[PDB]
């Protein structure tokens, strides 16, 4: 389903090359910056959960935006993803005129392309989002974004507000099949005692990277295939090798465990659900019609 105001053909007349421009850029950029794909995918999710899929977190004045200096490491996002959205927007501006394609639409398109260039399934992206001029505050971030220490009941409660369900939860967490995570996001599972749900061999390996509390290092989210979009994330879970509590508790909790097992056994079933759930996620509290603006410069208010 597609929310009121969005359409697949939104730029057919105004910028018909838009999706090819975004895709070509992401394909080129990840050759140099393999982690950009993870950065762009997470930036789309992060934005969506902080007030709605409205590019609010791209603004220089926004908490966790590109100028963020106060936030903890796991709320300090990969710098190259912010810049890639801007560069893409610039190329769309040259080809189709400025302020035609919204930054929110670029976020959704770039996430899709990042999934594909990493080996994942393509899917059609509904378009027509408008951009919000509102700066995100710290309270917006804390109110919208569950921490990695969250367990399944709390995660489902957050998702149910915006009409995502357990299957969406398990499929969308598969975004952690690529990318990086800071020691601080899982060090509670290592200090002062090991979490019993950590695979003991895996825990030993983590302690190599994070030998003490407060280690300023990152490791891979997916110990099996760090940069390939695939179902290995769920294979990790079945072997107690999820990095975050919010990862591993999907396998612990009865509400989610059989979905994890299904996606561990069948990458095809994971891919088929992930595309559906991504389309749902990219429509959370979107602005459409005359709401919001088409931002000319993704980092700044018009
Ligand atoms: C809602 C539950 C979620 C939680 C609690 C969560 C938590 C986290 C944490 C703690 C990090 C690492 C930050 C750091 O330590 O530097 C991370 C990274 C990441 N997340 Fe999630 N996340 C969630 C959902 C998602 C979703 C739905 C997606 C995409 C569909 C996603 C995609 C990513 C990616 C790609 C990264 C790696 C970013 C990079 O390497 O630059 N996450 N997430
Ligand atoms: C990083 C900033 O972006 C561009 C210019 O409009 C500014 O002068 C500055 O260089
Ligand atoms: Ca992987
Ligand atoms: Cl250009
Ligand atoms: Cl630190
Ligand atoms: Cl497949
Ligand atoms: Na937002």
GROMACS .gro file of C-alpha atoms and ligand atoms in nm:
model
  360
    1UNK     CA    1   0.000   0.000   0.000
    2UNK     CA    2   0.094   0.364  -0.066
    3UNK     CA    3   0.004   0.654   0.164
    4UNK     CA    4  -0.218   0.940   0.054
    5UNK     CA    5  -0.011   1.181  -0.154
    6UNK     CA    6   0.266   0.940  -0.261
    7UNK     CA    7   0.301   0.770  -0.597
    8UNK     CA    8   0.553   0.564  -0.789
    9UNK     CA    9   0.531   0.797  -1.092
   10UNK     CA   10   0.569   1.123  -0.897
   11UNK     CA   11   0.869   1.251  -1.097
   12UNK     CA   12   0.771   1.104  -1.435
   13UNK     CA   13   0.722   1.454  -1.580
   14UNK     CA   14   0.938   1.675  -1.358
   15UNK     CA   15   1.253   1.465  -1.326
   16UNK     CA   16   1.221   1.132  -1.510
   17UNK     CA   17   1.594   1.052  -1.470
   18UNK     CA   18   1.580   1.100  -1.092
   19UNK     CA   19   1.605   0.734  -0.992
   20UNK     CA   20   1.885   0.664  -1.239
   21UNK     CA   21   2.080   0.967  -1.112
   22UNK     CA   22   2.050   0.850  -0.751
   23UNK     CA   23   2.138   0.490  -0.839
   24UNK     CA   24   2.441   0.580  -1.052
   25UNK     CA   25   2.578   0.799  -0.774
   26UNK     CA   26   2.538   0.534  -0.505
   27UNK     CA   27   2.692   0.267  -0.729
   28UNK     CA   28   2.995   0.489  -0.794
   29UNK     CA   29   3.038   0.611  -0.437
   30UNK     CA   30   3.034   0.270  -0.265
   31UNK     CA   31   3.325   0.157  -0.485
   32UNK     CA   32   3.541   0.399  -0.283
   33UNK     CA   33   3.341   0.396   0.043
   34UNK     CA   34   3.202   0.045   0.099
   35UNK     CA   35   3.043   0.151   0.430
   36UNK     CA   36   2.841   0.427   0.263
   37UNK     CA   37   2.569   0.176   0.177
   38UNK     CA   38   2.519   0.097   0.545
   39UNK     CA   39   2.539   0.469   0.621
   40UNK     CA   40   2.265   0.561   0.374
   41UNK     CA   41   2.034   0.275   0.474
   42UNK     CA   42   2.061   0.366   0.841
   43UNK     CA   43   2.021   0.739   0.769
   44UNK     CA   44   1.683   0.669   0.605
   45UNK     CA   45   1.568   0.457   0.899
   46UNK     CA   46   1.705   0.709   1.150
   47UNK     CA   47   1.529   0.998   0.984
   48UNK     CA   48   1.205   0.813   0.966
   49UNK     CA   49   1.208   0.741   1.337
   50UNK     CA   50   1.297   1.091   1.433
   51UNK     CA   51   0.969   1.274   1.365
   52UNK     CA   52   0.877   1.100   1.031
   53UNK     CA   53   1.032   1.045   0.690
   54UNK     CA   54   1.087   1.408   0.631
   55UNK     CA   55   1.464   1.470   0.612
   56UNK     CA   56   1.453   1.659   0.945
   57UNK     CA   57   1.778   1.495   1.061
   58UNK     CA   58   1.968   1.630   0.758
   59UNK     CA   59   1.932   1.988   0.886
   60UNK     CA   60   2.237   2.156   1.036
   61UNK     CA   61   2.029   2.264   1.333
   62UNK     CA   62   1.897   1.914   1.410
   63UNK     CA   63   2.008   1.688   1.694
   64UNK     CA   64   2.207   1.396   1.542
   65UNK     CA   65   2.233   1.600   1.221
   66UNK     CA   66   2.557   1.658   1.030
   67UNK     CA   67   2.680   1.916   1.282
   68UNK     CA   68   2.613   1.699   1.588
   69UNK     CA   69   2.893   1.713   1.845
   70UNK     CA   70   2.712   1.636   2.175
   71UNK     CA   71   2.554   1.299   2.108
   72UNK     CA   72   2.700   0.968   2.226
   73UNK     CA   73   2.892   0.764   1.968
   74UNK     CA   74   2.595   0.547   1.869
   75UNK     CA   75   2.397   0.863   1.789
   76UNK     CA   76   2.686   1.015   1.590
   77UNK     CA   77   2.612   0.896   1.238
   78UNK     CA   78   2.853   0.813   0.954
   79UNK     CA   79   2.966   1.148   0.804
   80UNK     CA   80   2.984   1.030   0.443
   81UNK     CA   81   2.611   0.948   0.427
   82UNK     CA   82   2.508   1.309   0.498
   83UNK     CA   83   2.742   1.431   0.224
   84UNK     CA   84   2.625   1.170  -0.028
   85UNK     CA   85   2.265   1.285   0.006
   86UNK     CA   86   2.379   1.643  -0.056
   87UNK     CA   87   2.588   1.548  -0.360
   88UNK     CA   88   2.301   1.345  -0.506
   89UNK     CA   89   2.064   1.636  -0.448
   90UNK     CA   90   2.308   1.867  -0.629
   91UNK     CA   91   2.315   1.643  -0.937
   92UNK     CA   92   1.934   1.623  -0.942
   93UNK     CA   93   1.932   2.001  -0.916
   94UNK     CA   94   2.155   2.038  -1.220
   95UNK     CA   95   1.957   1.792  -1.430
   96UNK     CA   96   1.601   1.880  -1.329
   97UNK     CA   97   1.622   2.224  -1.172
   98UNK     CA   98   1.655   2.299  -0.806
   99UNK     CA   99   1.402   2.222  -0.549
  100UNK     CA  100   1.218   1.966  -0.762
  101UNK     CA  101   1.315   1.637  -0.587
  102UNK     CA  102   1.277   1.642  -0.210
  103UNK     CA  103   1.558   1.541   0.023
  104UNK     CA  104   1.318   1.294   0.188
  105UNK     CA  105   1.266   1.122  -0.147
  106UNK     CA  106   1.643   1.109  -0.201
  107UNK     CA  107   1.680   0.940   0.139
  108UNK     CA  108   1.428   0.669   0.048
  109UNK     CA  109   1.577   0.616  -0.300
  110UNK     CA  110   1.937   0.608  -0.175
  111UNK     CA  111   1.847   0.349   0.090
  112UNK     CA  112   1.694   0.124  -0.176
  113UNK     CA  113   2.000   0.163  -0.399
  114UNK     CA  114   2.227   0.090  -0.101
  115UNK     CA  115   2.039  -0.234  -0.039
  116UNK     CA  116   2.075  -0.332  -0.406
  117UNK     CA  117   2.444  -0.244  -0.448
  118UNK     CA  118   2.517  -0.448  -0.132
  119UNK     CA  119   2.356  -0.757  -0.290
  120UNK     CA  120   2.001  -0.713  -0.162
  121UNK     CA  121   1.661  -0.710  -0.332
  122UNK     CA  122   1.537  -0.421  -0.540
  123UNK     CA  123   1.191  -0.278  -0.481
  124UNK     CA  124   0.982   0.013  -0.607
  125UNK     CA  125   0.990   0.323  -0.387
  126UNK     CA  126   0.682   0.547  -0.351
  127UNK     CA  127   0.773   0.912  -0.396
  128UNK     CA  128   0.634   1.258  -0.326
  129UNK     CA  129   0.754   1.315   0.030
  130UNK     CA  130   0.792   1.677   0.139
  131UNK     CA  131   1.072   1.802   0.363
  132UNK     CA  132   1.023   1.940   0.711
  133UNK     CA  133   1.179   2.268   0.828
  134UNK     CA  134   1.163   2.159   1.193
  135UNK     CA  135   1.496   2.096   1.367
  136UNK     CA  136   1.504   1.766   1.555
  137UNK     CA  137   1.568   1.806   1.927
  138UNK     CA  138   1.729   1.562   2.168
  139UNK     CA  139   1.381   1.482   2.299
  140UNK     CA  140   1.264   1.397   1.948
  141UNK     CA  141   1.552   1.151   1.915
  142UNK     CA  142   1.510   0.995   2.258
  143UNK     CA  143   1.134   0.976   2.203
  144UNK     CA  144   1.156   0.814   1.861
  145UNK     CA  145   1.462   0.588   1.860
  146UNK     CA  146   1.488   0.275   2.076
  147UNK     CA  147   1.835   0.206   2.218
  148UNK     CA  148   2.023  -0.116   2.140
  149UNK     CA  149   1.959  -0.220   2.501
  150UNK     CA  150   1.585  -0.245   2.426
  151UNK     CA  151   1.411  -0.582   2.435
  152UNK     CA  152   1.132  -0.714   2.215
  153UNK     CA  153   0.821  -0.597   2.409
  154UNK     CA  154   0.950  -0.241   2.417
  155UNK     CA  155   1.047  -0.257   2.049
  156UNK     CA  156   0.703  -0.384   1.948
  157UNK     CA  157   0.536  -0.109   2.150
  158UNK     CA  158   0.732   0.157   1.958
  159UNK     CA  159   0.654  -0.006   1.623
  160UNK     CA  160   0.284  -0.056   1.699
  161UNK     CA  161   0.239   0.322   1.732
  162UNK     CA  162   0.322   0.359   1.362
  163UNK     CA  163   0.145   0.036   1.254
  164UNK     CA  164   0.448  -0.190   1.215
  165UNK     CA  165   0.420  -0.540   1.358
  166UNK     CA  166   0.649  -0.821   1.478
  167UNK     CA  167   0.724  -0.937   1.124
  168UNK     CA  168   0.825  -0.581   1.030
  169UNK     CA  169   1.040  -0.567   1.343
  170UNK     CA  170   1.230  -0.883   1.255
  171UNK     CA  171   1.264  -0.801   0.884
  172UNK     CA  172   1.372  -0.440   0.936
  173UNK     CA  173   1.632  -0.538   1.198
  174UNK     CA  174   1.792  -0.730   0.911
  175UNK     CA  175   1.931  -0.392   0.808
  176UNK     CA  176   2.206  -0.492   1.051
  177UNK     CA  177   2.327  -0.739   0.789
  178UNK     CA  178   2.566  -0.453   0.694
  179UNK     CA  179   2.749  -0.178   0.880
  180UNK     CA  180   2.927  -0.104   1.206
  181UNK     CA  181   2.850  -0.072   1.576
  182UNK     CA  182   3.038   0.107   1.857
  183UNK     CA  183   3.159  -0.075   2.170
  184UNK     CA  184   2.928   0.147   2.376
  185UNK     CA  185   2.623  -0.005   2.204
  186UNK     CA  186   2.689  -0.355   2.339
  187UNK     CA  187   2.942  -0.310   2.621
  188UNK     CA  188   2.665  -0.361   2.880
  189UNK     CA  189   2.661  -0.724   2.759
  190UNK     CA  190   3.030  -0.758   2.848
  191UNK     CA  191   3.079  -0.555   3.168
  192UNK     CA  192   3.077  -0.630   3.453
  193UNK     CA  193   2.964  -0.983   3.356
  194UNK     CA  194   2.894  -1.154   3.022
  195UNK     CA  195   2.534  -1.162   2.902
  196UNK     CA  196   2.430  -1.532   2.917
  197UNK     CA  197   2.275  -1.504   2.569
  198UNK     CA  198   2.609  -1.413   2.412
  199UNK     CA  199   2.774  -1.701   2.236
  200UNK     CA  200   3.080  -1.748   2.457
  201UNK     CA  201   3.323  -1.769   2.164
  202UNK     CA  202   3.166  -1.455   2.016
  203UNK     CA  203   3.188  -1.278   2.353
  204UNK     CA  204   3.559  -1.354   2.364
  205UNK     CA  205   3.606  -1.204   2.019
  206UNK     CA  206   3.410  -0.891   2.115
  207UNK     CA  207   3.628  -0.845   2.423
  208UNK     CA  208   3.930  -0.838   2.188
  209UNK     CA  209   3.784  -0.524   2.028
  210UNK     CA  210   3.635  -0.378   2.350
  211UNK     CA  211   3.875  -0.487   2.627
  212UNK     CA  212   3.726  -0.245   2.881
  213UNK     CA  213   3.420  -0.029   2.930
  214UNK     CA  214   3.431   0.290   2.727
  215UNK     CA  215   3.647   0.163   2.440
  216UNK     CA  216   3.622   0.404   2.145
  217UNK     CA  217   3.611   0.142   1.871
  218UNK     CA  218   3.358  -0.009   1.631
  219UNK     CA  219   3.310  -0.365   1.509
  220UNK     CA  220   3.086  -0.519   1.241
  221UNK     CA  221   2.715  -0.569   1.304
  222UNK     CA  222   2.718  -0.896   1.104
  223UNK     CA  223   3.013  -1.115   1.205
  224UNK     CA  224   2.951  -1.345   0.907
  225UNK     CA  225   2.924  -1.105   0.609
  226UNK     CA  226   2.991  -0.749   0.731
  227UNK     CA  227   2.931  -0.574   0.396
  228UNK     CA  228   2.696  -0.808   0.206
  229UNK     CA  229   2.321  -0.760   0.229
  230UNK     CA  230   2.198  -1.115   0.296
  231UNK     CA  231   2.028  -1.327   0.562
  232UNK     CA  232   2.349  -1.398   0.760
  233UNK     CA  233   2.226  -1.153   1.026
  234UNK     CA  234   1.962  -1.411   1.123
  235UNK     CA  235   2.209  -1.699   1.106
  236UNK     CA  236   2.406  -1.503   1.367
  237UNK     CA  237   2.096  -1.473   1.588
  238UNK     CA  238   2.026  -1.847   1.579
  239UNK     CA  239   2.385  -1.901   1.699
  240UNK     CA  240   2.360  -1.631   1.970
  241UNK     CA  241   2.586  -1.395   1.771
  242UNK     CA  242   2.363  -1.091   1.744
  243UNK     CA  243   2.565  -0.786   1.843
  244UNK     CA  244   2.299  -0.582   2.027
  245UNK     CA  245   2.050  -0.689   2.290
  246UNK     CA  246   1.785  -0.558   2.049
  247UNK     CA  247   1.927  -0.804   1.792
  248UNK     CA  248   1.964  -1.119   2.004
  249UNK     CA  249   1.635  -1.076   2.191
  250UNK     CA  250   1.454  -1.129   1.860
  251UNK     CA  251   1.565  -1.493   1.888
  252UNK     CA  252   1.488  -1.511   2.260
  253UNK     CA  253   1.133  -1.376   2.255
  254UNK     CA  254   0.851  -1.607   2.141
  255UNK     CA  255   0.684  -1.315   1.960
  256UNK     CA  256   0.974  -1.298   1.714
  257UNK     CA  257   1.182  -1.617   1.735
  258UNK     CA  258   1.002  -1.821   1.469
  259UNK     CA  259   1.032  -1.531   1.222
  260UNK     CA  260   1.407  -1.515   1.288
  261UNK     CA  261   1.428  -1.890   1.231
  262UNK     CA  262   1.235  -1.857   0.905
  263UNK     CA  263   1.469  -1.585   0.775
  264UNK     CA  264   1.775  -1.779   0.892
  265UNK     CA  265   1.656  -2.079   0.689
  266UNK     CA  266   1.543  -1.884   0.379
  267UNK     CA  267   1.714  -1.571   0.249
  268UNK     CA  268   1.442  -1.556  -0.019
  269UNK     CA  269   1.173  -1.524   0.248
  270UNK     CA  270   1.377  -1.256   0.424
  271UNK     CA  271   1.426  -1.058   0.102
  272UNK     CA  272   1.056  -1.086   0.008
  273UNK     CA  273   0.953  -0.946   0.348
  274UNK     CA  274   1.231  -0.686   0.375
  275UNK     CA  275   1.118  -0.504   0.061
  276UNK     CA  276   0.760  -0.489   0.186
  277UNK     CA  277   0.868  -0.364   0.530
  278UNK     CA  278   1.109  -0.104   0.386
  279UNK     CA  279   0.825   0.044   0.181
  280UNK     CA  280   0.613   0.065   0.496
  281UNK     CA  281   0.897   0.222   0.697
  282UNK     CA  282   0.964   0.491   0.436
  283UNK     CA  283   0.604   0.614   0.471
  284UNK     CA  284   0.607   0.684   0.845
  285UNK     CA  285   0.448   1.024   0.910
  286UNK     CA  286   0.534   1.166   0.570
  287UNK     CA  287   0.446   1.519   0.466
  288UNK     CA  288   0.265   1.539   0.132
  289UNK     CA  289   0.067   1.778  -0.084
  290UNK     CA  290   0.148   2.131   0.030
  291UNK     CA  291   0.274   2.031   0.376
  292UNK     CA  292   0.642   2.104   0.433
  293UNK     CA  293   0.870   2.224   0.155
  294UNK     CA  294   1.094   2.097  -0.120
  295UNK     CA  295   1.429   2.169   0.041
  296UNK     CA  296   1.680   2.324  -0.197
  297UNK     CA  297   1.982   2.250   0.018
  298UNK     CA  298   1.938   1.935   0.223
  299UNK     CA  299   2.147   2.066   0.517
  300UNK     CA  300   1.965   2.399   0.550
  301UNK     CA  301   1.619   2.549   0.578
  302UNK     CA  302   1.482   2.727   0.277
  303LIG     C1  303   1.450  -0.014   1.572
  303LIG     C2  304   1.549  -0.089   1.626
  303LIG     C3  305   1.694  -0.053   1.593
  303LIG     C4  306   1.790  -0.035   1.684
  303LIG     C5  307   1.773  -0.044   1.838
  303LIG     C6  308   1.911  -0.003   1.613
  303LIG     C7  309   2.031   0.024   1.672
  303LIG     C8  310   2.147   0.050   1.603
  303LIG     C9  311   2.275   0.081   1.664
  303LIG    C10  312   2.301   0.091   1.816
  303LIG    C11  313   2.363   0.100   1.566
  303LIG    C12  314   2.514   0.132   1.582
  303LIG    C13  315   2.542   0.278   1.614
  303LIG    C14  316   2.685   0.285   1.664
  303LIG     O1  317   2.715   0.217   1.766
  303LIG     O2  318   2.768   0.355   1.600
  303LIG    C15  319   2.295   0.079   1.440
  303LIG    C16  320   2.355   0.088   1.315
  303LIG    C17  321   2.292   0.061   1.196
  303LIG     N1  322   2.155   0.041   1.181
  303LIG    FE1  323   2.023   0.007   1.332
  303LIG     N2  324   1.885  -0.004   1.477
  303LIG    C18  325   1.751  -0.035   1.461
  303LIG    C19  326   1.685  -0.044   1.341
  303LIG    C20  327   1.744  -0.035   1.216
  303LIG    C21  328   1.673  -0.044   1.091
  303LIG    C22  329   1.520  -0.061   1.082
  303LIG    C23  330   1.763  -0.031   0.992
  303LIG    C24  331   1.740  -0.035   0.839
  303LIG    C25  332   1.639  -0.100   0.779
  303LIG    C26  333   1.894  -0.017   1.052
  303LIG    C27  334   2.013  -0.005   0.985
  303LIG    C28  335   2.134   0.018   1.045
  303LIG    C29  336   2.262   0.022   0.977
  303LIG    C30  337   2.280   0.000   0.825
  303LIG    C31  338   2.356   0.048   1.068
  303LIG    C32  339   2.508   0.063   1.042
  303LIG    C33  340   2.537   0.212   1.021
  303LIG    C34  341   2.678   0.238   0.970
  303LIG     O3  342   2.761   0.144   0.960
  303LIG     O4  343   2.710   0.355   0.938
  303LIG     N3  344   1.879  -0.018   1.190
  303LIG     N4  345   2.162   0.050   1.466
  304LIG     C1  346   3.086   2.336   0.356
  304LIG     C2  347   3.009   2.459   0.311
  304LIG     O1  348   2.931   2.419   0.193
  304LIG     C3  349   2.948   2.490   0.070
  304LIG     C4  350   2.952   2.644   0.084
  304LIG     O2  351   2.824   2.704   0.058
  304LIG     C5  352   3.009   2.692   0.219
  304LIG     O3  353   3.090   2.808   0.199
  304LIG     C6  354   3.094   2.584   0.289
  304LIG     O4  355   3.209   2.554   0.212
  305LIG    CA1  356   2.558  -0.958   0.587
  306LIG    CL1  357   2.613   1.863  -1.058
  307LIG    CL1  358   3.384   0.592   2.392
  308LIG    CL1  359   1.793  -1.457  -0.267
  309LIG    NA1  360   1.273   1.292   1.033
   0.00000   0.00000   0.00000
